[PDB]
Ligand binder design. Structure first.
Ligand code: B12
Ligand SMILES: CC(C)(CO)[C@@H](O)C(=O)NCCC(=O)NCCS[C@@H]1C[C@H]2CC(=O)N2[C@@H]1C(=O)O
Ligand SMILES: C[C@H]1O[C@@H](n2cnc3c(N)ncnc32)[C@H](O)[C@@H]1O
Ligand code: MET
Ligand code: SF4
Ligand SMILES: [K+]
Ligand SMILES: [K+]
Length: 661
């Protein structure tokens, strides 16, 4: 027995309950807490709200770890649990808890305590104070306490020191049950891991770890090494490191080598996801090379958010120079180390013009493989979320639902994301056009369908990358019956419905549309199809017509045997459903295109190219099977989550044999 403590921190994808384990093991250092409280297995997998609430039996404390993806459902769980147990202490923490609660407890009178920011100290003090004959919640630092419906702000939060020396839930065995649950249910999952806390920078849109603009604090060395071995010994294939700037600290290289050696010795992890440092440096490169050799790498972060000087000044971000970015791209490409760059659509002062020009400048600098875009969200505690900032830049938002809602689910259970869809610099019509533009760049250029053609036209015919993809959108949007035109127009109407119908889900957008879901059904059953997944597969379905219609657009540019030759190469290099790894795939060309796109001089040299790819995707785990459309989809585009941009879309030259004729 004892006072039962329930943790709830759910998400649609399985992530081990790190928060619950951290708070529990830190609090249990108090012998009174360890003796009096009976900590329950954390709830982290999604279930119907009523089922989840029914699973909480005689709770003394209900602890909710609240993010944008679970706030509404966890408030509903608390409401139902509070109804049945009037004396349960409901405490909510996490970055969706507002720093300034205001009228929070009027809207959520079933919540009793709000924890602000890092929660170890406050949670331990809460549980300790609850054991007293006269609990004094108004002395607990870093919390706000409900009195009636008023929020009584407690003393300022206390944080852990520069060297964080706290218990590890992994090493203490309290994460064993969560792994077992995932494995019992056959679920792929991520283990969460922190090596430090904080980001030293100040991007106004961001709320990373509730600790931007902060002095960095490190978890102790020995704990981290023990945890690396724990992950490896428990065959955790997928590791998610939460650091804001991996590579920013000298020891990050030693951590990277330790993970590579763990993979070599124990077979795990196989994939490590992490955000790499903003001010990318030699250490980031050394880490990426180490993980490339061990096949742990999921892509080196070289993110920009925006490239426009006024936008960056408005959001308090300094990027590396465009020429330094180009030099980085060359260095990584020479080692075949995958990089990626993120942009945010709708940032303060960003126009459709600057948005498209920035994208083109990134391709110009050498980013052809991985460009990612996110709709700007107003996070509760980001510096950008003030009435003054929103008014100054004219930010207009809609409460955007995140997921498709099963029929019969009450509307107060739908998670919402405060999404910007219009600014003073970007009207909503231009927002829609800009969103479609970069989606097309993703499935056409990153997706390879026109990447080599575009590079050839840029380097031999002076057709700029922005010009090329702007021309595609202008030309084909006026031609509704072409393959590409149908895609542009479907995206235009989708993204206008996306704004006008806040219920259309951010994370299941394709799946929410019956016609788009029907188009992808032969390729697989997924809730998480992305727009660029859908675009890539739609072209795969009508591949031959796509290329005949592409010729007509090329005529409008003033554009020949060499162009005819590179078009055949651009057609053959794409992965197709009939590809057989046993037989391979070969063709003959008037030029050595593999040598050219690897940096060589373009020469009229007749060559035979024989592609012999055996597998695709992360760790080469997807093997094509001719005629099997499901197997083709996995090899071509991988999983929708995690994002699959390494070893996909097209046949690779490293596996190709080029012989002279
Ligand atoms: C891993 C991760 C994910 C995972 C989900 C992880 C999960 N299910 O738990 C995935 C990859 C799915 C994800 C997605 C997104 N994410 Co994310 N993600 C993170 C990341 C890197 C780590 C979260 C984590 O576990 N941290 C480690 C834990 C230990 O720390 P913590 O969250 O700070 O917890 C402490 C305090 O909050 C407090 N606390 C927390 N819970 C509780 C509970 C109680 C009772 C108490 C007392 C205290 C308390 O104590 C903890 C320990 O000190 C964070 C950034 C970060 N470093 O925190 C962003 C972050 C959570 N993501 C964010 C965003 C915006 C998103 C997206 C929604 C949008 C995007 N990125 O473009 C997308 C999803 C979009 C879509 N669906 O298409 C924001 C969320 C802000 C918010 N208000 O929710 C963050 C903070 C990053 C940012 N940009 O500022 N995310
Ligand atoms: C089927 C679902 C879609 C639920 O209906 C389920 O599969 C799910 O919810 N899946 C997570 C999808 C997701 O969160 N996508 C966002 C893009 S990626 C994510 C954010 C980007 C920057 C950073 O650090 N990353 C993270 C990463 O790269 O992991
Ligand atoms: C980790 C990545 O998450 C993105 N990111 C961070 N904060 C936000 C936000 N408020 N809205 C959208 N995307 C965001 C940035 O592109 C960053 O590089
Ligand atoms: C975690 S955000 C992405 C990585 C890095 N901090 C950047 O902004 O470039
Ligand atoms: S975007 Fe990256 S650099 Fe900027 S505040 Fe967030 S974590 Fe720090
Ligand atoms: K803050
Ligand atoms: K260090």
């Amino acid at each position: 027995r004892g006072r039962k403590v329930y943790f709830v921190g759910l998400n649609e994808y399985p992530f081990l309950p790190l928060v619950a384990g951290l708070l529990r093991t830190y609090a249990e250092q108090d012998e009174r807490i360890a003796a009096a409280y009976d900590f329950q297995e954390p709830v982290f997998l999604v279930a119907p709200v009523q089922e989840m609430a029914d699973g909480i039996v005689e709770p003394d404390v209900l602890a909710l770890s609240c993010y944008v993806w679970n706030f509404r459902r966890q408030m509903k769980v608390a409401k139902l649990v509070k109804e049945r147990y009037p004396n349960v202490l409901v405490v909510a923490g996490g970055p969706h808890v507002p720093d300034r609660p205001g009228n929070f407890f009027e809207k959520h009178p079933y919540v009793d305590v709000l924890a602000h920011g890092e929660g170890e100290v406050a949670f331990r003090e809460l549980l300790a104070t609850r054991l007293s004959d006269h609990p004094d919640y108004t002395a607990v630092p870093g919390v706000s306490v409900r009195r009636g419906t008023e929020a009584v702000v407690g003393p300022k939060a206390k944080r852990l020191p520069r060297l964080i020396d706290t218990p590890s839930p992994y090493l203490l065995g309290v994460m064993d049950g969560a792994v077992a649950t995932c494995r019992e249910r056959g679920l792929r999952f991520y283990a969460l891991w922190e090596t430090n806390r904080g980001c030293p920078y100040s991007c106004s849109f961001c709320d990373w770890g509730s600790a931007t603009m902060s002095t960095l604090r490190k978890f102790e060395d020995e704990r981290l090494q023990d945890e690396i071995e724990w992950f490896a010994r428990h065959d955790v294939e997928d590791l998610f490191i939460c650091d804001a700037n991996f590579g920013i600290m000298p020891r990050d290289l030693e951590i990277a080598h330790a993970l590579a050696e763990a993979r070599g010795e124990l077979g795990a992890p196989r994939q490590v996801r992490v955000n790499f440092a903003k001010n990318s440096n030699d250490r980031v490169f050394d880490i990426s090379k180490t993980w490339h050799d061990a096949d742990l790498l999921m892509g080196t972060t070289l993110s920009m958010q925006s490239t426009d000087m006024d936008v960056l000044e408005a959001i308090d971000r300094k990027n590396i120079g465009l020429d330094n970015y180009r030099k980085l791209q060359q260095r990584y490409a020479a080692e075949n180390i995958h990089t990626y760059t993120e942009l945010i659509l709708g940032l303060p002062m960003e126009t459709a013009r600057s948005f498209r020009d920035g994208i083109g400048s990134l391709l110009e600098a050498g980013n052809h493989e991985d460009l990612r875009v996110y709709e700007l969200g107003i996070l509760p505690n980001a510096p950008l979320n003030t009435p003054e900032k929103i008014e100054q830049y004219g930010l207009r938002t809609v409460p955007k639902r995140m997921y498709v809602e099963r029929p019969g689910t009450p509307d107060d259970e739908a998670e919402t994301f405060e999404m910007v869809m219009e600014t003073n610099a970007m009207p909503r019509d231009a927002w829609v056009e800009s969103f479609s533009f970069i989606q097309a760049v993703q499935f056409l250029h990153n997706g390879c369908y026109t990447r080599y053609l575009s590079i050839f036209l840029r380097q031999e015919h002076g057709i700029g990358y922005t010009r090329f993809y702007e021309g595609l959108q202008d030309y084909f949007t006026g031609r509704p019956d072409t393959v590409l035109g149908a895609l542009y127009l479907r995206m235009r109407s989708l993204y206008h419905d996306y704004i006008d119908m806040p219920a259309l889900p951010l994370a299941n957008l394709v799946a929410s549309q019956p016609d788009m879901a029907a188009d992808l059904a032969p390729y697989g059953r997924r809730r998480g199809w992305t727009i660029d997944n859908w675009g890539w597969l739609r072209i795969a379905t009508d591949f031959d017509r796509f290329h005949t219609e592409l010729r007509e657009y090329l005529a409008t540019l003033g554009l020949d045997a060499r162009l005819e030759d590179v078009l055949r190469f651009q057609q053959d290099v794409m992965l197709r459903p009939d590809y057989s790894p046993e037989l391979g795939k070969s063709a003959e060309y008037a030029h050595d295109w593999p040598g050219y796109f690897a940096g060589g001089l373009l020469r009229p040299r007749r060559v035979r190219v024989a592609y012999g790819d055996q597998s695709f995707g992360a760790n080469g785990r997807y093997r094509p099977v001719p005629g099997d459309l499901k197997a083709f989809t996995m090899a071509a585009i991988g999983t929708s989550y995690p994002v699959s941009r390494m070893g996909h879309f097209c046949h690779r030259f490293e596996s190709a044999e080029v012989t002279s004729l």
